[PDB]
Design a protein around this ligand. Structure first.
Ligand SMILES: OC[C@H]1O[C@@H](O)[C@H](O)[C@@H](O)[C@@H]1O
Ligand SMILES: [Mg+2]
Length: 339
C-alpha cells in the first residue's frame, strides 16, 4: 500500500520549476552561483507570484558539486546550504508542496560508469545525509528527488535510457539515496522520496529495468517533454499543434501505465513544457492534450521555467521574475486551469 503518497500528491494542482537558478553552475564555491546564468536572486515575492497564479507546488533544482568539500565528507559549504534553506523556506511560508533535488551533478561527479559504483553511491549518500539532516523538521509537503537525469554525458545512449549495465547502477543509486535519507530519522522516516530512471527517460526498455523499492513512501520521476520535436528546437522540429501527434504522448503514457500506474506506483513528471515558438494557440492545444492525458489517472507535473522568453536560449520562460508578471498569460492559464 502506497496510498499515503497518492494523497499528498493529489493536493497538487500543478507544479513549477525554479530553473537556471540554484542549479546554475557558475560562480564557483559562492552563493553568487544562483545569479550566474542571468537570473535575479530569488525572493519571497517571486515564489508568492508563482503560488498565487495556481502553481501550488514548486521544484527547486540545485547543483551542489562546486559547493562541496573534498571526499569522503563532501561537506556542503555552510553559506550555500543556508541559501538553499532560504529558498525552500519561501515555499514553506506559503504552505506549498516542494521538491528539492540534486541537479547538474552530471556535469561533475555523477557520471554513470558501472565500474565506479561505490564512489557514486557514496557521494550521493554523503550529500543527501547532510541535506536530510538540514531539513529533518520539515513537514510532509517537502519532498526529496535524489538525482536529476543521471547519465553519462556524451555516451551514445545518453538520451535513450543508457545501457542495461547503467540501468542497474541507477537502481543501486536510488537505494543509496533512499537508504541515506531514512537513516537520518525524524520526518525523513516517511518523507516522500522521488527516485528516477536513467536520464529521466520513459522508454519501455528503461521502465522495464527499473527496480521498485519496497519503501512505501516513494515515487517515480520522469521527464516527458513529449513530443520532443514540438517542445524543443532542432532539425525536424515544428511549432504547429493540431492533434495529429497526440498519439506520441498517448503511446508513451500507456507504457507508463503498463509499468508503474497500473501497479499502484506513484508517478510524477518533475519536468515538462514547450519552448515558445511564437505559437501561443498551439502550445495551449498541446497543454490540453498533454496534461489532460496525465489527469486521466491524477498524475501531476512540474513545468520547466528558466526565465528565458525574449532573449537567446531555450525559451521555457513563463514568469518574468524581474517584473513579477507572466510572459504569456494564455499559456499559463492553460496550465493552472488544467482541471
Ligand atoms: O530527458 C529529457 C530531455 O530530452 C532529451 O531528448 C533532450 O535532448 C534533453 O535536453 C532533455 O533534458
Ligand atoms: Mg513522523
Amino acid at each position: 500500500d502506497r496510498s499515503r503518497v497518492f494523497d499528498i500528491l493529489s493536493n497538487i494542482n500543478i507544479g513549477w520549476n525554479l530553473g537556471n537558478t540554484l542549479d546554475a553552475t557558475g560562480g564557483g564555491n559562492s552563493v553568487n552561483a544562483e545569479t550566474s546564468w542571468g537570473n535575479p536572486k530569488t525572493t519571497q515575492e517571486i515564489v508568492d507570484t508563482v503560488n498565487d497564479r495556481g502553481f501550488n507546488a514548486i521544484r527547486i533544482p540545485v547543483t551542489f558539486a562546486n559547493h562541496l568539500g573534498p571526499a569522503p565528507e563532501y561537506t556542503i559549504s555552510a553559506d550555500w546550504l543556508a541559501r538553499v534553506k532560504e529558498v525552500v523556506d519561501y515555499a514553506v511560508n506559503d504552505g506549498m508542496y516542494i521538491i528539492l533535488d540534486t541537479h547538474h551533478e552530471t556535469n561533475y561527479w555523477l557520471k554513470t560508469d558501472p565500474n565506479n559504483e561505490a564512489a557514486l553511491c557514496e557521494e550521493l549518500a554523503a550529500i543527501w545525509k547532510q541535506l536530510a539532516e538540514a531539513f529533518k523538521d520539515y513537514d510532509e509537503k517537502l519532498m526529496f528527488e535524489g538525482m536529476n537525469e543521471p547519465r553519462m554525458a556524451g555516451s551514445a545512449k545518453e538520451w535513450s535510457g543508457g545501457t542495461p549495465a547503467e540501468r542497474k547502477l541507477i537502481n543501486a543509486m536510488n537505494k543509496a539515496f533512499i537508504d541515506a535519507v531514512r537513516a537520518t530519522g525524524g520526518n525523513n522516516a516517511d518523507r516522500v522520496l522521488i527516485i528516477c530512471t536513467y536520464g529521466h527517460n520513459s522508454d519501455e526498455p528503461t521502465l522495464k529495468d527499473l527496480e521498485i523499492p519496497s519503501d512505501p513512501n516513494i515515487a517515480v520521476a520522469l521527464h516527458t517533454y513529449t513530443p520532443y520535436f514540438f517542445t524543443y528546437v532542432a532539425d525536424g522540429s515544428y511549432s504547429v499543434w493540431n492533434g495529429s501527434k497526440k498519439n506520441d504522448i498517448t503511446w508513451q503514457y500507456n507504457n507508463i501505465k503498463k509499468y508503474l500506474i497500473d501497479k499502484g506506483i506513484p508517478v510524477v513528471i518533475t519536468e515538462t513544457g514547450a519552448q515558445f515558438k511564437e505559437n501561443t494557440e498551439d502550445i495551449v492545444r498541446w497543454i490540453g492534450d498533454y496534461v489532460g492525458t496525465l489527469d486521466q489517472d491524477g498524475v501531476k507535473c512540474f513545468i520547466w521555467d528558466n526565465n528565458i522568453y525574449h532573449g537567446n536560449g531555450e525559451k521555457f520562460g513563463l514568469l518574468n521574475r524581474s517584473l513579477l508578471k507572466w510572459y504569456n498569460d494564455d499559456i499559463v492559464d492553460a496550465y493552472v486551469n488544467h482541471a
